[PDB]
Design a protein around this ligand. Structure first.
Ligand SMILES: CC(C)CCC[C@@H](C)CCC[C@@H](C)CCC[C@@H](C)CCOC[C@@H](CO)OCC[C@H](C)CCC[C@H](C)CCC[C@H](C)CCCC(C)C
Ligand SMILES: CC(C)CCC[C@@H](C)CCC[C@@H](C)CCC[C@@H](C)CCOC[C@@H](CO)OCC[C@H](C)CCC[C@H](C)CCC[C@H](C)CCCC(C)C
Ligand SMILES: CC(C)CCC[C@@H](C)CCC[C@@H](C)CCC[C@@H](C)CCOC[C@@H](CO)OCC[C@H](C)CCC[C@H](C)CCC[C@H](C)CCCC(C)C
Ligand SMILES: CC(C)CCC[C@@H](C)CCC[C@@H](C)CCC[C@@H](C)CCOC[C@@H](CO)OCC[C@H](C)CCC[C@H](C)CCC[C@H](C)CCCC(C)C
Ligand SMILES: CC(C)CCC[C@@H](C)CCC[C@@H](C)CCC[C@@H](C)CCOC[C@@H](CO)OCC[C@H](C)CCC[C@H](C)CCC[C@H](C)CCCC(C)C
Ligand SMILES: CC(C)CCC[C@@H](C)CCC[C@@H](C)CCC[C@@H](C)CCOC[C@@H](CO)OCC[C@H](C)CCC[C@H](C)CCC[C@H](C)CCCC(C)C
Ligand SMILES: *C/C=C(C)/C=C/C=C(C)/C=C/C1=C(C)CCCC1(C)C
Ligand SMILES: *C/C=C(C)/C=C/C=C(C)/C=C/C1=C(C)CCCC1(C)C
Ligand SMILES: *C/C=C(C)/C=C/C=C(C)/C=C/C1=C(C)CCCC1(C)C
Ligand SMILES: CCCCCCCCCCCCCCC
Ligand SMILES: CCCCCCCCCCCCCCC
Ligand SMILES: CCCCCCCCCCCCCCC
Ligand SMILES: CCCCCCCCCCCCCC
Ligand SMILES: CCCCCCCCCCCCCC
Ligand SMILES: CCCCCCCCCCCCCC
Ligand SMILES: CCCCCCCCCCCCC
Ligand SMILES: CCCCCCCCCCCCC
Ligand SMILES: CCCCCCCCCCCCC
Ligand SMILES: CCCCCCCCCCC
Ligand SMILES: CCCCCCCCCCC
Ligand SMILES: CCCCCCCCCCC
Ligand SMILES: CCCCCCCCCCC
Ligand SMILES: CCCCCCCCCC
Ligand SMILES: CCCCCCCCCC
Ligand SMILES: CCCCCCCCCC
Ligand SMILES: CCCCCCCCC
Ligand SMILES: CCCCCCCCC
Ligand SMILES: CCCCCCCCC
Ligand SMILES: CCCCCCCC
Ligand SMILES: CCCCCCCC
Ligand SMILES: CCCCCCCC
Ligand SMILES: CCCCCCCC
Ligand SMILES: CCCCCCCC
Ligand SMILES: CCCCCCCC
Ligand SMILES: CCCCCCCC
Ligand SMILES: CCCCCCCC
Ligand SMILES: CCCCCCCC
Lengths: 231, 231, 231
């Protein structure tokens, strides 16, 4: 395990996701409100899935070698397995907060699936120049998602409770900033142009992942917006 | 890319799915009705997914070699990845049109999953005679789906709005004819008996795919059946 | 096929799932009640999926070799493909019976996904001692599911119809006993410590699978709890 310099960040990531999972699990024990239960379920599952995939990367299972540029390049494929399930759960948290219509939710989840799926294909593609074609398609799917979060959701939040409108606005802003960093790190890291070494890349993704999951969850689950308006 | 004679049909397929995706995306921009949004979301996602998988076939990612009959046989596995997601979306379009009950929808999607999954296993099976066992099981799942579309849905459409009944009937008929061709092409093509060469097989699937997705979508999204009855 | 001593149990399993599938399919033909249709759909799909995966194991497709302990160890990976889809369907049968809230259903299905997914990783892991780390995480996800079935569902059933409360209690008890045997068989069988040989392991899983699917389904589909209260 320690044979890879990036192991320290995989281990820290595993620990922080594990701790985040346990914290949300305990916190949600005292919850009976049916609406709050939905948000706790979604939000606890996110770091639990990430915990398993960080562990698989730490132990070496979630790593494969991909030939491109005349080299055997270490590619952590387990990231995409994580993201396939956790990024639509994160979007679902946002969509339920603002009572999004079903068509909009399906558009978001579908675009998200395309985003992660094409990122996976790009990560595993052996023809170097083609990796960036997949990156571009994935990034276009991301831009669609960000567009919807701003010009379909923000003006939906404003007709809702003030506490859900303010909580949505904060989580929207956190999401757009954090999620936009992922394609940049991929592009300059070992999957793309290879300018930033894998150990630093792994650190960067770990900070983004913990912030986008445990950070996000801490903000959401401390808000009164997750509860039905009750006396 | 041009090293494979079937590349021209993969390229045309990619282009037509891409163009179809953009057309539906633009067309649905001016839509606020919650019901119509569902149909636009579902129907736009279908060629978008197909676009990505056609591209993966064009670039060579979605192709593998399978030993059977003492030969290395080129198998485009990306078709099944496409179909796994797009065929239940197509069925969902039909089921929502007639306000199908939840049990019926689950039966359809489940049978569809079995249909595509067993087709994939058959496509990748190395014992030649066993490929046709999987083809038979998949075809039985197809026949179940077609049965339900006729003797569970058609008489559901007739108690609904005339515009939804007439639109459903047309899309049902398009679906049954087009979908029934797929097992025949598989059986006589490079996956099955090998009587029709891969380049012609690829052409045939491209015509079926564009018709079943973009053709289907053009009929559906031009109907007033996708809108709630409103003043 | 007969080259593997466990083939007889794979063949019997295939037959019993096939027969169970046909029986439930015929039985549900005379059903119009929308609630009952849901239970028939879910419950018929379960042995149908299991039939396909038992067949893939019989024909040899669903088997791979995994190096650990200095040996090539036969691992039937198709079990996890089965279980990935059938165990959440089984939980859905239980959850719908007691009209579980959406948050609880998502927690169950999510924990179940983690349970099966980590079992799959453990089954395919090449470092022997690490296989048991994945077994432990999977078992913890199982224990969560069993906890919810007892201390979240049982007291939900009691405020419902007596026929649904009594049917739920029986199916809950069947589920907890049968499902708890699976991690034990894995641990002592060819995936784990290797004390029980593969042919006996295969027998054990076949008895558990038929009981947990066809047995379970026979109890559920003969109950009046699956019908809406109607005059
Ligand atoms: C009911 O609605 C609220 C339940 O949501 C909360 C439900 C949770 C989503 C349940 C899912 C967590 C499972 C219990 C997962 C089990 C293994 C976990 C990964 C635990 C890992 C952390 C520990 C090992 C440090
Ligand atoms: C509604 C939304 C969910 C829409 C989803 C959007 C989605 C369509 C976007 C594209 C997804 C698609 C790229 C998934 C591809 C998975 C694939 C990378 C798995 C690895 O297999 C690739 C090659 C080795 O590189 O296998 C070597 C050759 C092997 C023989 C491969 C044969 C097995 C195939 C992988 C079977 C395909 C199954 C499905 C792709 C399962 C989807 C997995 C998940 C990653 C989407
Ligand atoms: C809101 O409900 C309506 C939105 O549906 C319409 C929503 C669409 C389903 C959004 C999904 C499309 C994504 C934007 C996919 C991005 C890449 C596409 C494959 C674009 C490819 C076509 C172009 C490259 C020729
Ligand atoms: C409700 C509905 C959805 C019901 C669904 C119906 C469904 C049950 C029908 C059968 C689906 C099942 C056949 C999927 C099999 C996928 C498999 C072909 C992927 C390729 O792996 C096959 C061999 C190489 O040929 O791998 C070589 C050996 C490797 C070590 C394989 C180990 C990895 C396994 C593939 C893990 C299994 C994961 C699940 C099958 C994911 C499902 C993928 C999708 C195609 C259904
Ligand atoms: C409508 O709601 C009730 C339908 O549920 C019942 C619907 C069923 C879930 C339909 C799914 C079964 C498909 C017809 C599967 C076809 C192949 C089967 C595996 C048949 C195998 C058994 C036989 C070959 C012995
Ligand atoms: C809401 C709930 C559903 C939550 C779900 C919980 C879930 C997160 C729990 C963990 C699931 C995760 C372990 C699935 C891993 C599948 C993996 C074993 C498939 C086989 O690939 C493993 C190695 C060979 O051993 O591939 C060799 C290297 C290859 C290059 C691998 C590259 C292809 C990757 C497999 C692509 C990943 C796609 C997704 C994992 C699809 C999920 C399949 C299913 C088994 C969950
Ligand atoms: C918890 C993990 C999260 C929130 C991950 C988010 C990841 C993305 C938004 C990834 C986006 C990518 C692209 C837009 C193109 C390049 C490849 C990706 C997959 C890194
Ligand atoms: C957009 C793509 C569509 C509508 C594809 C439909 C495909 C089928 C109905 C495929 C059916 C098959 C069988 C019935 C058995 C042989 C294998 C298949 C998968 C080709
Ligand atoms: C129809 C099949 C059923 C009901 C299978 C149930 C399987 C399980 C509950 C498996 C549990 C496992 C663990 C808890 C850890 C070890 C690995 C598994 C996957 C066997
Ligand atoms: C969105 C953030 C992307 C920028 C990442 C900056 C990383 C700077 C680290 C120094 C680069 C290491 C190069 C020498 C090894
Ligand atoms: C459902 C349509 C299946 C029939 C396809 C007919 C294809 C005819 C093309 C000629 C066959 C090529 C054989 C000589 C290369
Ligand atoms: C939950 C049941 C697990 C116990 C399984 C008992 C199997 C006993 C069979 C005898 C073991 C075979 C060892 C000699 C080959
Ligand atoms: C490819 C995996 C996509 C599914 C991820 C799980 C999250 C799905 C959330 C469903 C949202 C509800 C839509 C109506
Ligand atoms: C194996 C992939 C199956 C899922 C495909 C996505 C479409 C699912 C549509 C869900 C229909 C709603 C059922 C209640
Ligand atoms: C990884 C596969 C998980 C999906 C299995 C299919 C069963 C899903 C049942 C959905 C229950 C409804 C939740 C709201
Ligand atoms: C186009 C929608 C406006 C809100 C999205 C902001 C786009 C940020 C760009 C992210 C950088 C990705 C490379
Ligand atoms: C049995 C249901 C009647 C409607 C379905 C028509 C079946 C068409 C056969 C398709 C050919 C597949 C090989
Ligand atoms: C902790 C919840 C109480 C009900 C679950 C009973 C646990 C049975 C243990 C199963 C054995 C697995 C190794
Ligand atoms: C070796 C790099 C070749 C450049 C490929 C860039 C493709 C980016 C596509 C953006 C439309
Ligand atoms: C393919 C990228 C699309 C980003 C711009 C959004 C187009 C308008 C969509 C309106 C729902
Ligand atoms: C080499 C071909 C052997 C014939 C197999 C046909 C099987 C079809 C099954 C239909 C019930
Ligand atoms: C070779 C076996 C080494 C023992 C591993 C047991 C790990 C079990 C983890 C339970 C917390
Ligand atoms: C509760 C702490 C969980 C941390 C387990 C994984 C950390 C890796 C240590 C090497
Ligand atoms: C908008 C046109 C999209 C076409 C891109 C793929 C066509 C392949 C050209 C070689
Ligand atoms: C209807 C009987 C189904 C049995 C088919 C599979 C049994 C395997 C026989 C070798
Ligand atoms: C993006 C950083 C999130 C910070 C989380 C802090 C949570 C405290 C309530
Ligand atoms: C099956 C062929 C479909 C033809 C689509 C034409 C759409 C015009 C409205
Ligand atoms: C766990 C054993 C189940 C027994 C099923 C018998 C069904 C008869 C109604
Ligand atoms: C990591 C366990 C958290 C302890 C409880 C925190 C207050 C709910
Ligand atoms: C008003 C919300 C500001 C949140 C910005 C957080 C940036 C990481
Ligand atoms: C809305 C601001 C987006 C900031 C992008 C930051 C990418 C590192
Ligand atoms: C391909 C872009 C379509 C242009 C608009 C067509 C009329 C909505
Ligand atoms: C009355 C509907 C006829 C549609 C037939 C289309 C055949 C491709
Ligand atoms: C309902 C008519 C079906 C026609 C099947 C055509 C197969 C090529
Ligand atoms: C296996 C076929 C079952 C025959 C009908 C049983 C009574 C519904
Ligand atoms: C009162 C229900 C008892 C069911 C026990 C079944 C054990 C297999
Ligand atoms: C509730 C009793 C569980 C029995 C476990 C049996 C495991 C073989």
């Amino acid at each position: 395990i320690t044979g890879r310099p990036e192991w320290i960040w995989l281990a820290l990531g595993t620990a922080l996701m594990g701790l985040g999972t346990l914290y949300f699990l305990v916190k949600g024990m005292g919850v009976s409100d049916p609406d709050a239960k939905k948000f706790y379920a979604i939000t606890t599952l996110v770091p639990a899935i990430a915990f398993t995939m960080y562990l698989s990367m730490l132990l070496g299972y979630g790593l494969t070698m991909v030939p491109f540029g005349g080299e055997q390049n270490p590619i952590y494929w387990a990231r995409y397995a994580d993201w396939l399930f956790t990024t639509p759960l994160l979007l679902l948290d946002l969509a339920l907060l603002v009572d999004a219509d079903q068509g909009t939710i399906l558009a978001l989840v579908g675009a998200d699936g395309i985003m992660i799926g094409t990122g996976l294909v790009g990560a595993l593609t052996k023809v170097y120049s083609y990796r960036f074609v997949w990156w571009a398609i994935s990034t276009a799917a991301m831009l669609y998602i960000l567009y919807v979060l701003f010009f379909g959701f923000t003006s939906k939040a404003e007709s809702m409770r003030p506490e859900v409108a303010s909580t949505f606005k904060v989580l929207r802003n956190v999401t757009v900033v954090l999620w936009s960093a992922y394609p940049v790190v991929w592009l300059i890291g070992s999957e793309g142009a290879g300018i930033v070494p894998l150990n630093i890349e792994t650190l960067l993704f770990m900070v983004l992942d913990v912030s986008a999951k445990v950070g996000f969850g801490l903000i959401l689950l401390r808000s009164r917006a997750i509860f039905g308006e009750a006396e």
